[PDB]
Amino acid sequence: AEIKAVSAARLLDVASGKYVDNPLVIVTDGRITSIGKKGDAVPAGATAVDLPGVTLLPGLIDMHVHLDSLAEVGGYNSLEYSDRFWSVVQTANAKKTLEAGFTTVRNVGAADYDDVGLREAIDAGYVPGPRIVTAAISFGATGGHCDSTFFPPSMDQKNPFNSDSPDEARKAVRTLKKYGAQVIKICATGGVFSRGNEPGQQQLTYEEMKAVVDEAHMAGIKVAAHAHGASGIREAVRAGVDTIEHASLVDDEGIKLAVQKGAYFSMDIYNTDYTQAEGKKNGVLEDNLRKDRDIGELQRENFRKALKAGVKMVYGTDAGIYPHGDNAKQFAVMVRYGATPLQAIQSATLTAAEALGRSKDVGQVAVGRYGDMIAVAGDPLADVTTLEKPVFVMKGGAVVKAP
C-alpha cells in the first residue's frame, strides 16, 4: 500500500472549530486511516511528511467553478478558438485549482461534456486535478441565461438542452445523467453575463423547476439553480432545489423559505472586484459590466443578511469569471460581510461536503475520509487570508505542494 504519515504543528477540526496539537495523520491508499500524535507508531513502509510550524486543514471545496472557461477570454474573443481548445485548457485550470488547495470542486456548466471528460481523466490518474462533481451542460429556458444569447437568428445558436416545459426539462435531466451529470445545474433567472435579460427576471416556472428536482432526486442527484432575482430564488427553493447559486437579490421570504427547507446558498461575492477591474479589457460588453455593478454590492449585503438569518452557506466562487487558482480570495470577502473565519472555512469544507452529499468522503480531516489536506502558515481561525497561500497541499495521499 501507499502510506504517508503527515505531521504538523496543529490541525483544525472544522466540525468543532478547535485546534488539535501535534497531529500525525496517516493516509493509506488515499484514505485517512489515523489521526494521532507526532511520535506515535507508524505502519511499516510509511513515508514521513513533516510540516513544522504550520496548521493542517481539510482540502478546500469550491462549489461553483467553470474549469473549461478562461477569465481573460470574455465576450466574442472566445470565438477565435476551436472547440477542443477549451477541452484541453481545462486541464491547466484543474491543475491551478488543485495547487491552490482546492481538492474537490463542483463544475456547474461546461461545454459538450468537457467536465465529464476531465473528471474521468483525473480519476483514472492521467492528469492531476480536484475531485470534480460534474454538472455537464447547464440549462434553462429558451432565450434565457443558460442559452446562447449573443447572436442573430440567422446563426440559429441555441443550447440543445433549452427546456420550455416540465416534461422537456425532465428529459434534459435524463439525458444529462445518461452522459455523466452527477448534479444538475439550471438557470432560474436572468443574469450578468448573458444578453437580453436582467438578473431579477425569473426564467423558469415553478412547475418547470419542480419537474427538474423531482427527476434529479429520483436518481439521487442534487440540483443547483442559478438565481439572482427574488422570485426565482423563492420558487426554486419552494420547488426543492438543493443549492441556490448567486442568490443575489434574495428577499425576506426567500431567506425564510431557505432556512425552513434547508436550502444552501452559494454566493460568489468576490468576483465583482475582478470583473470591474479587468472585464472591459477582457472583452466583456458594457451592458454586462453594468449588470455586474447592479448586483455586486447588493449580493454582498444580502450574504450578510442571509448568513445572520441562519441560511446554510457554501463556498462557491464562480472561478472562470475570475482567474482559476485565485479561488481562496473570497474567504476574506465573506468575513468582511459578516462571517467568522471559522464559518468561512466551514463553508468550503464541512458545509460544502454536506451540500454535496459527500460528508463521508471529503470536507473534514477524519478517519475514513479521503486524505485531502492543506497546510497554512499562521492562525486561520484568526486570519482567513492565510488560506490564500497554502504551503502544503495533498490529494488522495499524493503530495501536490510542500515546503
Ligand X SMILES: CP(=O)(O)N[C@@H](CCCNC(=N)N)C(=O)O
User: Which residues of the chain form contacts with ligand X (CB under 6 A)?
Assistant: 109, 191-194, 226, 246, 268, 271-272, 292, 295-296, 299, 318, 321
Task: Give the one residue of 242, 292, 318, 326 binding Zn ion; rule: CB under 5 A.
Answer: 318
Q: CA-based angle 22:25:30, to the nearest 5? A: 160
Contacts by 13-19, CB closer than 8 A, 24 or more apart: 13/364, 13/365, 14/57, 14/58, 14/342, 14/345, 14/346, 14/349, 14/350, 14/363, 14/364, 14/365, 15/350, 15/364, 15/366, 17/342, 17/381, 19/55, 19/381
**Residue 193 near which of ligand X, a second copy, Zn ion, none (CB within 5-8 Å, type-dependent):** ligand X
Report the residue number, 135 or 173, with the smaller CB distance to ligand X: 135
Report the residue number, 237 or 295, with the smaller CB distance to ligand X: 295
Report the residue number, 114 or 318, with the smaller CB distance to Zn ion: 318
Amino acid at 114: D
**Residue 371 near which of a second copy, ligand X, Zn ion, none (CB within 5-8 Å, type-dependent):** none
DSSP state of 370: B
Phi and psi torsions of 201, nearest 5°: -80, 120
Owner of C-alpha cell 480531516: 365
**Residue 116 near which of Zn ion, ligand X, a second copy, none (CB within 5-8 Å, type-dependent):** a second copy
Query: Binding site annotation covers 226?
Result: yes
Report the residue number, 115 or 268, with the smaller CB distance to a second copy: 115
CA atoms within 13 A on the CB side of 239: 29
Among the candidate windows 1-9, 220-228, 331-339, 392-400, which touches Zn ion by CB under 5 A?
Answer: 220-228
**Residue 126 near which of ligand X, a second copy, Zn ion, none (CB within 5-8 Å, type-dependent):** a second copy
300 near Zn ion, judged by CB under 5 A = no
Task: Give the one residue of 106, 226, 238, 395 binding Zn ion; rule: CB under 5 A.
Answer: 226
Please state the closest distance from residue 82 (CB atom) to a second copy, in A.
5
Query: Binding site annotation covers 185?
Result: yes
Please state the closest distance from residue 109 (CB atom) to ligand X, in A.
6
**Residue 295 near which of ligand X, a second copy, Zn ion, none (CB within 5-8 Å, type-dependent):** ligand X
Report the residue number, 210 or 246, with the smaller CB distance to ligand X: 246
| Chain-centre distance for alpha carbon 224 | 11
Please state the closest distance from residue 124 (CB atom) to a second copy, in A.
8
- Strand 31-37 and strand 47-58: the pairing is unpaired
Please state the closest distance from residue 123 (CB atom) to a second copy, in A.
10
Report the residue number, 292 or 318, with the smaller CB distance to Zn ion: 318
Please state the closest distance from residue 226 (CB atom) to Zn ion, in A.
3
Report the residue number, 115 or 245, with the smaller CB distance to a second copy: 115
Residue nearest to Zn ion (CB): 226
As beta bridge partners, residue 395 has: 398
Please state the closest distance from residue 277 (CB atom) to a second copy, in A.
22
Task: By CB under 8 A, name the binding residues for a second copy.
Answer: 81-92, 112-118, 120-121, 126-127, 179-180
Query: Binding site annotation covers 228?
Result: no
Owner of C-alpha cell 460568489: 268
Q: How far apart are CA 345 and CA 168, in angstroms?
A: 39
Strand order in the sheet with 102-107: 60-65, 102-107, 131-134
Q: How far apart are CA 372 and CA 30, in angstroms?
A: 8
> What grid cell was written down for 9?
504543528
Nearest one of 237, 208, 234 to 224, comparing CA atoms: 237
Report the residue number, 6 or 188, with the smaller CB distance to Zn ion: 188
Alpha helix (H) ranges present in 338-385?
A: 341-347, 350-356
Amino acid at 238: R
Q: Specify whether the CB–CB gap between 10 and 379 falls below 8 A.
A: no
Please state the closest distance from residue 371 (CB atom) to a second copy, in A.
23
**Binding-site residues for Zn(2+):** 64, 66, 185, 226, 246, 318
* Chain contacts with Zn ion (rule: CB under 5 A): 226, 318
| Sequence ranges of the binding site | 64, 66, 185, 226, 246, 318
